[PDB]
Design a protein around this ligand. Structure first.
Ligand SMILES: *[C@@H]1O[C@H](CO)[C@@H](O[C@@H]2O[C@H](CO)[C@@H](O)[C@H](O)[C@H]2NC(C)=O)[C@H](O)[C@H]1NC(C)=O
Ligand SMILES: *[C@@H]1O[C@H](CO)[C@@H](O[C@@H]2O[C@H](CO)[C@@H](O)[C@H](O)[C@H]2NC(C)=O)[C@H](O)[C@H]1NC(C)=O
Ligand code: NAG
Ligand code: NAG
Lengths: 165, 165
């Protein structure tokens, strides 16, 4: 009726979902997470304090094996937009971060769900801006003609290879 | 069916669980918490302010006597990953901390549960990065040839020996 089609689609896939548990049903393979980084601005290079302040655009993609649906049943609907707090999210971490509060470094609002089939799961896309404060060891031997290299390490803090890759 | 085995495992052990109460059933012995510390970086040594800024990796391990299960009933499942806010956590404190807000010094996301038997409980593993700001009394008698010793005290603020060891 007047209820949008996306309303019953969300009710259908969120019925038995439990966002506190890892959403994988297959035998023993992990959940593959793909990370993409875009650099937008180098805000600051603090030499006396030796940290780098970066503005980047982050994109994460993975397959949620519990959120698939058949488009033919929902008006040929293939995508749906949902809040990031309603589903399971990987705990991607910056190992050498100088900021512990993720509220001051990230802005997560919504996720995009694209069905792969009723039992195939749905591909999840996560987009968000970030401001990373990373520790950098600066070699000022050739100052002021020096070249610096900054390394950012990303990974999961609690999940090993058998769970998240 | 299509529901992952870990879904009904969580429903089984979280049925009567109450995370607001200490999870011990034995006669009078306390809960033994083992703490492990790894130093990753000395961020700063503020001499005029006399505090030390440390980047450490913390591991906490204890047995939850209410969260045991029999693996034979759940597809030989022995581990499970859960959110840290779903179970009881010890109130480990840094006595000489200069920062009261734990959001700015810690990053707790998930815990690992390993069954010890149906009525034996489960071993809980807690991993998280920290940035400790500890007050240090600096003795600059031999400056700039001085050696400094920094002490960090850890314990529970509200639980005594008979509860948490
Ligand atoms: C995640 O990535 C792994 C690669 O490490 C994928 O494993 C492949 O699986 C296909 C079958 O779907 C095989 O044909 C390939 O030979 C495998 N590659 C390797 C290197 O093992 C896995 O399928 C991906 N998807 C998951 C785990 O859900
Ligand atoms: C926590 O640690 C205490 C040690 O302080 C453990 O007490 C031991 O218990 C075993 C039996 O399981 C005895 O054989 C040992 O002699 C005890 N040692 C001491 C020093 O009393 C206790 O079992 C551990 N586990 C708890 C309390 O759950
Ligand atoms: C898409 O689904 C709608 C709803 O049933 C249907 O009317 C339409 O023919 C479908 N189109 C394609 C290309 O599948
Ligand atoms: C592990 O549990 C599964 C589930 O019943 C069973 O099929 C398998 O034989 C068990 N293996 C061992 C080594 O216990």
């Amino acid at each position: 009726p007047d209820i949008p089609i996306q309303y019953e689609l969300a009710n259908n896939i969120m019925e038995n979902y439990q966002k506190g548990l890892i959403p994988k049903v297959r035998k023993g393979s992990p959940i593959n997470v793909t990370l993409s980084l875009q650099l937008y601005q180098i805000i600051q290079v603090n030499e006396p304090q030796q940290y780098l302040l970066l503005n980047a655009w982050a994109v994460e993609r993975w397959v949620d094996q519990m959120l698939g649906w058949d488009p033919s049943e929902f008006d040929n609907e293939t995508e749906i937009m949902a809040r990031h707090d309603d589903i399971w999210l990987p705990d991607t971490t910056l190992y050498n971060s100088l900021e512990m509060d993720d509220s001051a470094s990230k802005k997560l609002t919504h996720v995009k769900l694209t069905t792969l089939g009723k039992n195939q799961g749905a591909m999840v896309e996560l987009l968000y801006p970030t401001i990373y404060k990373i520790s950098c060891l600066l070699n000022l031997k050739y100052f002021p003609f020096d070249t610096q290299t900054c390394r950012m390490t990303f990974g999961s803090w609690s999940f090993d290879n058998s769970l998240i890759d």
